[PDB]
Each structure stands twice: as structure tokens, then as C-alpha cells.
Design a protein around this ligand. Sequence first.
Ligand code: CL
Lengths: 214, 221
Amino acid sequence: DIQMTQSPASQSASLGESVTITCLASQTIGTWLAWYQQKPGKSPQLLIYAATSLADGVPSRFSGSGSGTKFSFKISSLQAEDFVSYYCQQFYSTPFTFGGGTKLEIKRADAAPTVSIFPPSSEQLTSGGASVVCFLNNFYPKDINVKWKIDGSERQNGVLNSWTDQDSKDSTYSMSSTLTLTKDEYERHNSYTCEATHKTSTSPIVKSFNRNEC
Amino acid sequence: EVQLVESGGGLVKPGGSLKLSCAASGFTFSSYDMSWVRQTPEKRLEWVAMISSGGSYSYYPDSVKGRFTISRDNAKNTLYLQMSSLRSEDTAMYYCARQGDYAWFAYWGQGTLVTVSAASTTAPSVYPLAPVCGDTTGSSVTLGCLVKGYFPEPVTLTWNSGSLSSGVHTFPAVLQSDLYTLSSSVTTVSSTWPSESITCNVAHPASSTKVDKKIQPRGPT
Ligand SMILES: [Cl-]
């Protein structure tokens, strides 16, 4: 089967910037390649077919080039609506195969996360579980680290994280971290801490509480 | 306008069967080669099957060969995908696509979702997340809602029945031990809460459950 290796997986750029995405075919495929866009919550749409031909209605800021194994897709001046995903596809031979996609993200000024910690709700403490939640909100750039501590001891087991896509309004990222314990284990310990490491500070942002303290 | 409308998706157990349909309009259906293309939860695109304009020739990747059958009824302007022996890795959004002279995909439908899972339908617990008890309050306050232990996706989550939309982040669900968990945060000026009501509204259609959880301050004891 023909493997289509698409790079980069993601790239950050400014409004107005020119960017180039590449697609490498594992064997020569002439100009038998297409490029698609996909907006959040929408189906893919054809932009380019036969390596270089623009689909009907597609703006001329989108272009494709190449023949053989190395293909390029270019956006000459990024507009707000263009910070979405793009895929290449070969139709030289069955099985038809797609590249892994590229997501374009918008650059903005660095922003430190706003960190909030939440003890288990009184309602949850009626279950067999207790969840401690930490929100790390409205930060930039996207890379961030969270560490949990219980009574000063680093805790990996029972931690699950979720990351938003880039915010359409302010171009920031947010992250939720949930530490789930049994209620019995929760009540065996006193201090619960969420520590956020981000490039905006050499020191982590630390939010903590002590159980059954007010 | 070219129109492709898929239907027939749903939640199916491994080993099960499902038949998808695609209603085509706004072009001469019988003139075009058609494919099904799927998009996995990881957002990978995978070609599933192709059928010639006249229906006489069909093509499949090895991943679905012997399990899936593409067909078409040119008189009814409909494309079909019969799925059998379904596997977890068949979980995807399935799109109907019209080809050009060659197999680029010129037009795509909106998709129909197929989920292959043995997991049992489970209603979530919904927990209000108020700030730490007796915390010193700054200029803004962040509240949350934890939606724990549901299957299948999705849930809908709003704040104040959708009237509170600014300063809201709803985090993608994470799957653990056949159950999803999601959370949402909302940030307001400290002069608005708790003086004004903030409620999390969660619906889980698959379990016919709907719950409202008002965020109340922790305490007073
Ligand atoms: Cl035919």
C-alpha cells in the first residue's frame, strides 16, 4: 500500500503568514494527489486535485505543487478561517490512502495559566470515589505539565487529563486534570496539590487545599 | 447544489451488522463513481469502498474486504454500505463521497456515526464544583461541573440553560474502563457569584437523563 507521510503534524503561524505543508509518497505517484481542508465539526472539502488544480470556488491563496514522491500545499497569506486541518490523499492505486493530517494553529502572546483546584463535591463523596479537579485555563503556548501531590507525595495513578482545542476568541488553550481516588483513600490524606509548569514562569503555579479545613 | 445525506449510523456490538444509506441529489447520480470514506476518533481518514457509476465494479481495502459490501440503486439515487462482522476499529464517522474522473473526493456528505462497542449504556453522575471552602475571593471566580461515568457519547452541557456562554470551557471527554468523563469550567466576575445563580445543565440522551446542578458555595460548616 502507498503510505502518505504528511508533515508537520501541527504548525503555529501568524495571521498573514505563508505556510507550506508537505506530503511524501512511499512510491512515485506522478500528480495523482489531492488536498483537503477540514473545519471543526465539518466534513472534509476538496481544495486541490491532480497535485496542482484548484477545485471550483477555492480561493487562489491555496496552491499545490509537486510530482513523483514530494508534494507541497501552500497557503500564501493565512486568514482567520484557515487555522484548521489539511490532509493529502493519493488516488494512484487502491487502496486509496490519506496522509495523517496537519493542524494549523494561530500564534499569540504568551499567557500564564489561571489555575483553580476543586475538592470532591459533597455529593460525590456518597459514591465509592472522590475526584479532585484542577483547571489550567487560558494559557499560551499549548505545552504544559501538571503534577499532583497528596501529602507532598507525587501521584500519577488515577490522573486523567483533557485539553481543549485552541480557543476561537482569544487563541489560548485550557486543560483539565482530574485525580480520582477511592473515598477511603481520599479521607486518609490531608493536603491535595495541583502544580502547573509552563514556560511563562521558572516556578510552578501551585494550588492546594487541606481536607475538611475551611 | 450537490447534496449527499448519510443515514443508518448507530451503536452496535462487536460482531454485529449495520446498513448505511447515502441519499444523493442535485446531480446525475448514475454518472459518478462513489466511495465511502471514514474518519476514526483519532481523526485519521480511511477509504472504505468504491463503486463504479453503473454499479458493476466495486473495490475494497483488505481491512473491510469480506465484511463490507458497497452497492447503489441508481433509480433511487442512493448509495449503500452493508457492514457485517463489525469490529471496534470500524468505529468512525462514515462519509459518502462523489468522485471525479479519478478517485479524488469532490463532494462529501455530513457523515453518519458508527460506534462498535460492547460497553453498557451508563448515565453520568453530575457534580457541582464550587471553589475551595473559605477561600479568599479575587476579582474573578471559576466554577466547574464534573460529568463522570457515562456511555455512550455524547452529553450536552450548558450553563444557565445556555444563557451563560462567555468564559466557558468544556473539555473533551476522556474514556476509561468503558466510561467517559467530561468537565466544564465557567469564569465570572466575583460580584456575579454567588449573588447570581449559576447552574450546570447536563443531558445524556442515550440514558434519557437530564440533571441540573446549581453551584452552591462550600460551607458554611
Ligand atoms: Cl459500471
